[PDB]
Amino acid sequence: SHMTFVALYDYESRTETDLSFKKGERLQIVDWWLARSLTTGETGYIPSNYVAPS
C-alpha cells in the first residue's frame, strides 16, 4: 500500500536498465529500485533518493 512513489526531480536514463522520469511522475516500486512508471508503463531501475512516497 506504501509502494507508490512520486518523482521529486527529473531524471534522464544513463543506461539500458534505468528509467527516465519527470518530476511529479508516479512510480510503482516492484539505492536503485525496480519500478514501473504509472505514466509510461515502462519498467526499469530508478534512484530511490529521487522519489518519495505518494
Ligand X SMILES: COC[C@H]1O[C@@H]2O[C@H]3[C@H](O)[C@@H](OC)[C@@H](O[C@H]4[C@H](O)[C@@H](O)[C@@H](O[C@H]5[C@H](O)[C@@H](O)[C@@H](O[C@H]6[C@H](OC)[C@@H](O)[C@@H](O[C@H]7[C@H](OC)[C@@H](OC)[C@@H](O[C@H]8[C@H](O)[C@@H](OC)[C@@H](O[C@H]1[C@H](O)[C@H]2OC)O[C@@H]8CO)O[C@@H]7CO)O[C@@H]6CO)O[C@@H]5CO)O[C@@H]4CO)O[C@@H]3CO
Using CB under 5 A as the criterion, which residues of the chain lie in contact with Cu ion when the complex forms?
Answer: 1-3
SS3 49: helix
Restricting to residues 1-54, name those near ligand X by CB under 6 A: 40-41
Question: How many residues contact ligand X, by CB under 6 A?
Answer: 2
Least distance from ligand X to the Cβ atom of residue 41, Å? 2
Nearer to ligand X, 39 or 49 (CB): 39
Do the strands 4-7 and 51-53 form a parallel or antiparallel pair, or are they unpaired? antiparallel
Which residue in 13, 5, 9, 8 sits closest to 35, CA to CA?
A: 5
In the chain, the amino acid numbered 39 is T
Give contact residues for ligand X (rule: CB under 6 A): 40-41
